[model samples]
Target: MGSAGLVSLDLPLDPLWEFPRDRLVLGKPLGEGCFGQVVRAEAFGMDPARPDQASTVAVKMLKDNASDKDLADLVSEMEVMKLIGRHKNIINLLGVCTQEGPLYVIVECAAKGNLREFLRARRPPLSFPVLVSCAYQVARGMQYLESRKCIHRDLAARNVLVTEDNVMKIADFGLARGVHHIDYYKKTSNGRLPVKWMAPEALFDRVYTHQSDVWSFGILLWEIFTLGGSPYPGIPVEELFSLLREGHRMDRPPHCPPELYGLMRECWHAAPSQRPTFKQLVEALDKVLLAVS
Candidate 1:
């Protein structure tokens, strides 16, 4: 693989104190999350032999108050990161920090920041073509994750990063898990949960399948169309859960394209089996793209 390929795939690196510090290029804060803060950094030591070469990366530093379970989750995340390598739409993992004091992860940097902020800055709102492109990029990333039997439990605009050229990369794999893992599907009060985008099954402690991930993608679609509007506006968490249990969902945001709206509705289906697969989603978004073209 080329150096760009290695950086894009998020290859695993030996977590040791010996990680070359000369590779450090730039460090810019990305955002703060339940686990900790994310910083965009670049490392030139991607190919030690070629000292002049480098790769832009993101670094996630866990908070000091992280619990044992949080630490364990981070380890599981590292395992998944190693499993995911070289996808255009997915953020790459260049290296990780697992030493004695605190936990940190090195990833490819998204120069434009997360999608939420990007949308907020737009005056009139994103055009249909741009929205479809964003959806397509996200679908591509989810397709890659599903192909590897992984489910991104959290999918939202805040988690989608964009580059200056408008290329999108899915970030924050802290909540991602393999679909077959029963423990990951279980409901835990300790874990970080984004209530607005969570599927009914996830909220109720039911098993989370790739289908649940699809449901979250639907919420992401909503965010893209509504300029990052809050999911379930004016609804309390308890009420949202209650409504989800009763098979309710957010109405399509005003001015959302009909086809996209329909797709989002299908994604939030009460039955996991009824949710569209990532492959199906790609096709649907392709049509949207074609129509705009």
Candidate 2:
């Protein structure tokens, strides 16, 4: 009944994603990241079914001792996830809890867990249909982000989540950026990017865009086809900079279709502009999916 009761928390940085942090019951943490940990939580008042009106949720809460910069980055990530709204292939932001100290971002739980591990645990020689299925789903998700001019700076299989119903939703917005910033977050010299999955342009010039994300997606697709095998397996991480600059690409997974191999090669095109768009990737994948099935 007060201003704090479901007032709809909104920030100047992002006003469109307005949700209340009134009643949340946090459970055990599901996973931990550098910035925060995602925990199982119960959110009340999101639905109107029973009187309790609660729905199970996953909360990505900001760490207590986070520095000002980390807090800012969390807020930025929240904004990107919020702006993404609701998409079949993208994780959905249910709400945010910011009334007190540690901020909490509520999201839907992916019951099946991390995609990379999912593929890893499966028996070797994953069926072509399954490989194409995962890749196609991720392609749809990336295409959706591309259409909105959003760059998932870190687009890898580990960042993808799968549901019990076999749906793959792209997650982790900690380093996501918009098309406006072209330097690929080069400002941060401390941490390293996902090198094996990185595009040549992004690795060499630190220029990231949706195209760079497409490159990462290509690696992710390879990971799927390889049943979660390491990317650029024999290559050392330090030497990756020079090797990638030389335009060397990972070899096709054994038994991978020549057409699919061509798709991955297109994604690794030396010039960012030369790479096919996500929409194009998705379209080509459709044909492959049909052929494989």
Candidate 3:
């Protein structure tokens, strides 16, 4: 089967323009994050050989200063992508460019861009039905990841890609890892770690479990409803620990609906055990859909 059939439904990357031989087929630079630069690129190999049916792909290039550890992490991510890319709710990996110069990973591009950018451009908060649908897709993706024994360590609006028809797909597996098989926990002398969306336990040198990811998902749900507002605004990292420890939680954004506020509260509970599993989350989101529909 072709790369398009192998992965999720795709849109054309032609508007971004094709690259010359010397320039390489790096289309438009989508955005930069903790991982590196991602761009919309035309498929080069077999897909391009048949011009009548070529597929458009997003190519992610790792930064030069990326650490050996980060490179290993990318390898792990690619492995996971190979396993789960076929799912409709998850972003698919088309190919990889690891020759030497400008290492790149080709993935299916979500034409409408990421949830963060979409929310930023939107005037008001998404309707309850739209939010629930987005949450349902994210929960479905998380369920798929969890079934494969993987954890999306960074689950946030910025990592969730959306299409023109409001279809949601989970992307950016850079921070993903197998739950029971973490090699070494990345640490810091002061006990700070990457990923601000993590729960209190995860941030303070604690082992990350599926439950922790659910906590992050709760924050992501809030962002989805609020149009990508920052979580726990006006609070620093050090203060976050004390607040979380004392039973404080992030307040729902003004744009969030009342029903979503309750759900977000349950997800961001101080005790990890109180948080719902992905399956439970999916069911809960489904009920929200029923109510709204």
Clashes of each: 4, 0, 0
Number of the top lDDT candidate:
2
* Worst-scoring 10-residue span by lDDT in model 3: 181-190
**What is the C-alpha lDDT profile of model 2 across 62-138, one tens digit per residue?**
55544666666667777777667578988888877665446777888887787888888886346888779889999
lDDT of candidate model 1 versus the reference: 0.75
Comparing 2 and 3 on TM-score, the stronger one:
2
lDDT value, candidate 2, whole model: 0.76
lDDT of 3 by residue, 18-70 (tens): 23223336677676554456777666442445553445667766666566556
Clashes of 3: 0
CA lDDT, candidate 3, residue 31: 60
lDDT of each: 0.75, 0.76, 0.70
Point out the higher-scoring one by lDDT: 1 or 2: 2
Which residue pairs in candidate 2 collide?
none
Kindly list the per-residue Cα lDDT of model 1 for residues 125-154, writing each as its tens digit. 488899889999999999998888777777
Candidate with better lDDT, 2 vs 3: 2
